Design a binder for this molecule. Sequence first.
Ligand code: SYV
Ligand code: MN
Ligand code: MN
Lengths: 137, 137
Amino acid sequence: MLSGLNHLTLAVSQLAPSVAFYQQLLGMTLHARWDSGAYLSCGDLWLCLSLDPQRRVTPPEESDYTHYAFSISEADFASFAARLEAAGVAVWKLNRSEGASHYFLDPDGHKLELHVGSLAQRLAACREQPYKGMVFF
Amino acid sequence: MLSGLNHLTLAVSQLAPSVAFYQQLLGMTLHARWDSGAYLSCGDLWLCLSLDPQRRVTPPEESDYTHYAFSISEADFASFAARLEAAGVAVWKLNRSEGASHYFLDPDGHKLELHVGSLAQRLAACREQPYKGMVFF
Ligand SMILES: Cn1c(=O)oc2cc(N)ccc21
Ligand SMILES: [Mn+2]
Ligand SMILES: [Mn+2]
């Protein structure tokens, strides 16, 4: 049986700007780097950056909704979002639901999110106000 | 500051086959399903499937190396990989080895992986057989 997420690998077009973004701007820990990649950690998340000549810098309009959300406390949310805004990081969506979320792009157009709250909190909200066609198990 | 992965959202072209893949074949826990999405969990991982008409099924040769790996134990690895092959699940190829892994595709061409081992184990293996240009911090 599967026990969780082992690692997330993002293809990047240029290693140096991506390391700067994830390590310096976002504060992740850099464990190792090589000619074509890097290993970072963010809490219990193992993140791999893989240099890939196939990766296009992709505008948000030309990619689908696939995205990766990082955990942050409500107390830290506003100052972290302000840091991204000062660095000029682009936003790809406004938060229109309950729950604190900030939607931002990485240098290659990967869709990222800061989110406060757990699955259990989302499910409780949804039991009060279910989406169209919602069934629980 | 960031503390890990909050959730992973995959855009899917058809909801029913994707739910079946992650729940029936991969054994993830289905918590809720509605007309345009589903919430699943895999250990600590919160997985969201989001129906997206923009999602195209892409051959692995024309998508980049971005991929998602799930943890499995040494005792279950081979028999789980055997069940996927028997079910006709397609495969893809990465440019580099990263230990005991099996690489497979979901119905929309998202690149998935089963992997045995932690970041710490990977770093120890790399010290004996480093990638080209590798440096450790
Ligand atoms: C088969 N099925 C299920 O188990 O939960 C559903 C929810 C919706 N909206 C539509 C179909 C199903
Ligand atoms: Mn999200
Ligand atoms: Mn991998």
